[PDB]
Amino acid sequence: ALAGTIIAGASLTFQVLDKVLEELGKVSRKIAVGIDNESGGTWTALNAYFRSGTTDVILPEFVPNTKALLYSGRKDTGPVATGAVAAFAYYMSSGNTLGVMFSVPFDYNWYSNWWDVKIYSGKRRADQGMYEDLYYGNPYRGDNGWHEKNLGYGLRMKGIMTSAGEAKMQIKISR
Amino acid sequence: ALAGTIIAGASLTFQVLDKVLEELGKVSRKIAVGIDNESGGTWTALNAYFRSGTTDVILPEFVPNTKALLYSGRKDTGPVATGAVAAFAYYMSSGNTLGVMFSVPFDYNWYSNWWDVKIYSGKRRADQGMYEDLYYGNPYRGDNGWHEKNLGYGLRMKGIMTSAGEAKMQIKISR
Amino acid sequence: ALAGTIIAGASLTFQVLDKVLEELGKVSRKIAVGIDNESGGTWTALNAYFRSGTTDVILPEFVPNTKALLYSGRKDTGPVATGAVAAFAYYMSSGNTLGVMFSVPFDYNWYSNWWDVKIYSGKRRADQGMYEDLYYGNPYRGDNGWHEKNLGYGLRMKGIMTSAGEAKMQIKISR
Amino acid sequence: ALAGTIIAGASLTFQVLDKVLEELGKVSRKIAVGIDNESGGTWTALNAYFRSGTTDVILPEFVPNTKALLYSGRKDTGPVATGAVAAFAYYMSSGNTLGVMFSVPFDYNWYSNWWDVKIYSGKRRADQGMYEDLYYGNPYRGDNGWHEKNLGYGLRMKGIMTSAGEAKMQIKISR
Amino acid sequence: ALAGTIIAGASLTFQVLDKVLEELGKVSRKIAVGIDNESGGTWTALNAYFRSGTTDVILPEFVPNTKALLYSGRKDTGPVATGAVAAFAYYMSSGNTLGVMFSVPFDYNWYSNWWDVKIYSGKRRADQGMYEDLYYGNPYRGDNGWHEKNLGYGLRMKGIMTSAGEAKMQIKISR
Amino acid sequence: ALAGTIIAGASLTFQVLDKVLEELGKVSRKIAVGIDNESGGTWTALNAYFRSGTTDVILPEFVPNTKALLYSGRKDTGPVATGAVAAFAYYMSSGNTLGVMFSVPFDYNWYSNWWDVKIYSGKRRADQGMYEDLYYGNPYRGDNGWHEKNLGYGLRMKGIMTSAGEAKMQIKISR
Amino acid sequence: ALAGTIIAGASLTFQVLDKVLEELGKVSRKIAVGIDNESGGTWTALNAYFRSGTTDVILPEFVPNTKALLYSGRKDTGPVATGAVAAFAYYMSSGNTLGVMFSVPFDYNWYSNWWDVKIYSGKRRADQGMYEDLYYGNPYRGDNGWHEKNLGYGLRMKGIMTSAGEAKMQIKISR
Amino acid sequence: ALAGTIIAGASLTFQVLDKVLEELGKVSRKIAVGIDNESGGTWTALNAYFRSGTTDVILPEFVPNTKALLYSGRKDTGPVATGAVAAFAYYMSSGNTLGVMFSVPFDYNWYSNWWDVKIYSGKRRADQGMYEDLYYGNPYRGDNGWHEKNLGYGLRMKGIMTSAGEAKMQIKISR
Ligand SMILES: CC(C)CCC[C@@H](C)[C@H]1CC[C@H]2[C@@H]3CC=C4C[C@@H](O)CC[C@]4(C)[C@H]3CC[C@]12C
Ligand SMILES: CC(C)CCC[C@@H](C)[C@H]1CC[C@H]2[C@@H]3CC=C4C[C@@H](O)CC[C@]4(C)[C@H]3CC[C@]12C
Ligand SMILES: CC(C)CCC[C@@H](C)[C@H]1CC[C@H]2[C@@H]3CC=C4C[C@@H](O)CC[C@]4(C)[C@H]3CC[C@]12C
Ligand SMILES: CC(C)CCC[C@@H](C)[C@H]1CC[C@H]2[C@@H]3CC=C4C[C@@H](O)CC[C@]4(C)[C@H]3CC[C@]12C
Ligand SMILES: CC(C)CCC[C@@H](C)[C@H]1CC[C@H]2[C@@H]3CC=C4C[C@@H](O)CC[C@]4(C)[C@H]3CC[C@]12C
Ligand SMILES: CC(C)CCC[C@@H](C)[C@H]1CC[C@H]2[C@@H]3CC=C4C[C@@H](O)CC[C@]4(C)[C@H]3CC[C@]12C
């Protein structure tokens, strides 16, 4: 009976697809970001632009001097094969913008964790352009290594990002 | 046997529908709203009009000056493909109405999170008209970005709404 | 074999009915009622008449002045397609009766939440007549909106009822 | 094969009976009873006679003046279609017996909650006769309403019983 | 095929027996016994003789005057259709023995709860003879009723036993 | 098909054996032993010899005068039809050995709980011989009864063992 | 159909192997070792050599005089039929090495628990040679018995090991 | 029917693969690392290079003198047959680099736990070269044994690594 075999095959297809979707839904991609502000002035949040994923918290409005920013991101809920990729911008009291990019990809056999920090002149909101500038420029690997560079404008950066799918990023901005 | 194949196909259909309804019922759409009142006077609640969804709390009767409003909304219980969309109104002591709209849709490949704040002359209750004015005017995206505008009548607004299906919205109204 | 097909169909019927009855039993209809008494005298409970549903608490015997009544209702246990509909009466010290109606229906595509408050001359127990008077008169919608009216006899009402199947109602009676 | 069809039908019958017995065993009928004693003297327990059901507590030996009796009853354990129906007796210090009846039936489309209180001359134990006198006399409905009557011998009663299958009963006996 | 039908029937038999044995194993028969000693002297435990069942505690060695005995019994573990039936004996300081019998049967449509208290001259250990004397004499029903009698030797008893399969017994021995 | 019937019968056999082994592994046999030492001197542990079962605690090294020994035993883990049977020895300061035997069998329709206490001249370790001397001599039944005897050497014993598969034994040794 | 019978048999084989591997994985073999040091000097850990199994703790670096060593071992994770067998060595301040062997086998119908303690001249690391010397010499049984011997060099040992698969070992080394 | 047998075999294959992937995902490989710094100066983290696995913590930025480093590593999430293998580097205040390697493999019948510590001239980041130098040089086995060596530059090392798949490593660096 053709119909009986079709029903058996459709049932097997249903079981396999159910398992596959459950597996895809259990994949975890998220990041916890901490940034120390020793720049000498308050930071004012502009926006976070998520190329992939979303967040369960609002971008904290202010980061006073000698205080820390706590932020986080995660992939979209469900069996969707995307990660947590974003760039966010804080307007500094010195009159320039601190842009921070992270990328925690879904497919780890084509991509890796990446991150970068840059200073943009004036007031600059995070968007796809800023994310492309940070990601396709010279970003750091999320390689469990500490990295240091002069940001310019009398500011320097020191930070690290882990290599895990549930990533941690720690950065200090100093003057 | 035709009847046996019909019964097998019906059993498979029942399994598939049970799975689909369970997944539809597991979709989460909700919003938590905080509004700081620095206008210089008490706010008196008028009403919340839900275009979609409902709420587990009553609209707080009063918001005193320098205090905050806590409110929330959620989608309807069950496998129903709708979100949490509403506009609510607070009569301010200055004699005008603060109207706030949020939209957290169900289907995110056609819609996005949106929100807006406006002041209406006199005492004005939230209804479908207020929701349409806010949503089909010039609303902000729930895009994880802070936005500021002059509300008029000596009042200004600064706020943010996240992009998640479980959204957070934070607004401060200031004079 | 006719008997074998009958057994297979009966088994499928049993599975479907089991699921349907479980789903019907999971539907939740309940209400939490709070009423502030600022009338200037004690209220004495008469009775609550439930058109639909029941309650897990006794109608509180007294509500002193400046105190609040806490009451609740819910639908009947099991896969029964009814809601929580009632009218209850408190004898006020002024010599008249405060009647309160709520309706939280089961089927939300034919009915909505409704509520009302009225004052009846003398001592009047809640019954089907009082429920019909409140429900088929000019009741308020449970629309997440605050409503105000003069009850008469030097008393006024201000209250709100939410639109959810698990509803909250808040009322204040004032003089 | 006749035997194979008999075995299939027997398996279906066993599944259906298992389901039915589980549901019958999940039905809950019970009552929690509180009685305030303001008669001016101690009450001494005589006995509780359960027409249906049983109890997890002993009838409290004494109820001193200005104290309260806490008692309870429940239906029999298992898939048995019976409720919690009883009459219990307390010998009052005045020399007469306070008899209290409650009925929380199993089948609510033939029966309802009922209760009553009476005083019997002298010392009188609860039995089937007392239960029949209270139940087939003029009992109150467990209808969420407060009721008052003069018990005689200088005593009066005020009480209420809820309409739920998990019932609450509150009575005060006063002089 | 005869063998295939035999395997199908044996599988159904195994399922039915598994369910029946589980149900039999879930039946609960136990008793909690409290006895107040106001006799004027210490009691010294002799033994408890269990006609049915066993216990999870040792018979307390002594019961001083104005103190209480706490004891318990239960049916045997597993799908065995027996109850908790025992008689236990305490040697009183006056030189005679207090024997106490309880019976909590398994099959409640042939038996009921029963209990009794007696005083035996001298030192008398509990055995089958004592249990038969108490059970087949004039025992009290576990009927939720308080009972009183003169034990003799200047001692009297007042006690009660509930009618449940998880029974409570409370007795006071007084002089 | 012979092979298909063999496979069906083997599957049924595997199910039955799995159930039987699970039930056998759920049988509980254990004992908790307390021994009060009022002999006037310290006891020094020699050894415990387990005819059946084992223990989760070490034999306490010393039991000082007026202190108590806590010990325990249990049946072997798994679906093995054996109980907790042992004899253990404490060398008393008076120069003789206190030997204690307990038996909590697996199969209760052939065996019963038994226990005994004896004093052996000099220093004597527990072994199969000591266990046989105590068990096949004149042991007490674990029958929920207190028993007393003169141990000799100026020492006497009073103790009790319960009849349960999870047994409790309490002994006091006195001088 | 040969293929269908092969598939049915392979499925049964899979079920049986899954159960067997789960059973093997639940077998527990572990040991907790405590050693009191009353030798008069500090012990310095050298190494533990595991003939079978592993450990979740590091060999404690030092055991000061009048302090205790806490160590543990266990069998390898998974359905592997091996136990917890080891010898470990502590260099004593007197210039010689304390070697301790334990064996907790997997298969208890061919092996038993064993243990021993020895002193080796000089500094001697634990290895297969030391384990063979202790295990194939004259080791003590883990028989729930206390054992005493003169270790030499002015030192003596007193200890005990239980007979369980989850074993406890207590040893004191004294001078 | 060829298609029916193919579907049955595919269903069995899917069950077997599901079981195998679940078991592979349950394998646990991780390491917890503690390093005491008694060198006389602060350590500054450079980086950790993971040949296999990843980590849930960032490499601690600094290790002050007389303080300890806490670090950890684990295998990649999912049914991937790899372990936790890494080398990490701390720049010491003396001007040289402390490099530490650990290896906790997945397949224990081809590999074993290994570890090593070395000092490299100047500032030297961990990479594949450092890992190869440590692992294919003369590393210590994670064999539950303490090991000591002179690191040079006036520094010495003493440490231990356990043999478990959930490994612990303790090292002290001293001057
Ligand atoms: C072959 C037979 C059994 C098909 C029966 C039609 C099924 C597929 C139809 C009938 C009723 C339908 C539902 C009706 C209403 C809703 C609520 C809506 O917000 C989302 C879709 C959902 C949940 C529909 C899903 C599809 C549905 C279950
Ligand atoms: C076809 C065969 C298997 C039918 C067997 C008859 C079944 C349906 C009968 C036999 C015994 C019956 C039970 C006997 C006693 C009680 C207790 C009563 O308070 C509620 C009904 C209940 C629980 C009955 C339900 C129906 C029942 C289980
Ligand atoms: C067709 C074949 C498999 C039938 C085998 C007979 C079955 C039904 C018999 C054999 C042994 C029996 C058990 C033997 C002992 C007891 C303990 C008693 O206190 C209650 C009944 C109970 C639990 C019996 C229930 C019925 C029983 C399980
Ligand atoms: C038809 C084939 C599969 C039958 C195989 C024989 C079965 C029934 C036999 C083989 C080994 C046996 C077990 C061997 C040892 C023990 C430990 C003993 O203390 C209780 C019984 C128990 C648990 C036996 C139960 C019965 C048993 C499982
Ligand atoms: C008919 C086919 C499927 C049979 C395949 C052979 C099976 C029975 C064999 C192959 C590999 C074997 C395992 C190999 C290794 C171990 C670890 C050892 O410490 C205990 C036994 C155990 C767990 C073996 C059990 C039996 C085993 C699973
Ligand atoms: C008959 C058909 C369905 C066979 C399909 C091939 C199966 C057996 C193959 C295809 C892909 C394979 C996997 C690919 C990658 C990995 C990660 C590796 O670290 C461990 C093995 C594992 C998990 C492989 C296991 C075997 C695997 C699942």
Side-chain angles (χ1 to χ4, degrees), chain D residues 4 21 64 89 112 125 131 145:
Chain D
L21 290 183
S112 307
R125 295 185 79 83
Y131 150 76

Side-chain angles (χ1 to χ4, degrees), chain G residues 10 13-14 17 20-21 24 79-82 106:
Chain G
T13 304
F14 171 54
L17 258 81
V20 164
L21 290 182
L24 281 175
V80 50
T82 50
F106 182 93

Side-chain angles (χ1 to χ4, degrees), chain H residues 10 13-14 17 20-21 24 78-82 106:
Chain H
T13 304
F14 155 83
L17 263 84
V20 165
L21 290 183
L24 281 176
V80 49
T82 49
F106 181 91

Side-chain angles (χ1 to χ4, degrees), chain B residues 9-10 13-14 17 20-21 24 78-82 106:
Chain B
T13 304
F14 155 83
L17 263 84
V20 165
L21 290 183
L24 280 176
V80 49
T82 49
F106 181 91

Side-chain angles (χ1 to χ4, degrees), chain A residues 5-6 8-9 12 15-16 19 143-147 158 160 162-166 168-170, chain H residues 7 10-11 14 18 44-48 50 54-62 71 74 125:
Chain A
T5 55
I6 289 189
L12 180 58
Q15 300 169 46
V16 173
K19 190 39 174 12
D143 47 32
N144 308 292
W146 290 90
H147 298 284
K158 171 166 186 177
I160 179 174
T162 65
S163 59
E166 315 199 331
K168 291 175 172 53
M169 195 162 80
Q170 169 60 38
Chain H
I7 297 184
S11 182
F14 155 83
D18 186 50
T44 299
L46 295 183
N47 68 305
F50 275 79
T54 184
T55 175
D56 300 314
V57 301
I58 68 167
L59 189 63
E61 194 184 350
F62 297 110
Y71 199 45
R74 62 156 174 87
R125 295 185 79 83

Side-chain angles (χ1 to χ4, degrees), chain D residues 53-134:
Chain D
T54 184
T55 175
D56 300 314
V57 301
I58 68 167
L59 189 63
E61 194 184 350
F62 297 110
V63 183
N65 189 37
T66 77
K67 296 294 152 13
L69 154 75
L70 286 159
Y71 200 45
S72 64
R74 62 156 175 88
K75 66 171 294 302
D76 298 341
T77 301
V80 49
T82 49
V85 191
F88 59 86
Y90 272 81
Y91 184 74
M92 296 174 291
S93 63
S94 64
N96 308 284
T97 297
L98 182 76
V100 178
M101 179 279 295
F102 58 78
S103 177
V104 180
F106 182 91
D107 201 335
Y108 270 118
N109 55 47
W110 313 118
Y111 303 108
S112 307
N113 284 9
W114 294 90
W115 69 283
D116 209 358
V117 177
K118 188 199 266 214
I119 297 185
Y120 297 85
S121 214
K123 168 127 49 181
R124 164 102 180 233
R125 295 185 79 83
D127 36 39
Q128 172 75 6
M130 179 175 303
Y131 150 76
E132 283 163 317
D133 171 67
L134 288 165

Side-chain angles (χ1 to χ4, degrees), chain A residues 69-90:
Chain A
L69 153 77
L70 286 159
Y71 199 46
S72 64
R74 61 156 173 89
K75 68 175 296 302
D76 299 342
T77 301
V80 50
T82 50
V85 190
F88 60 93
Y90 269 80

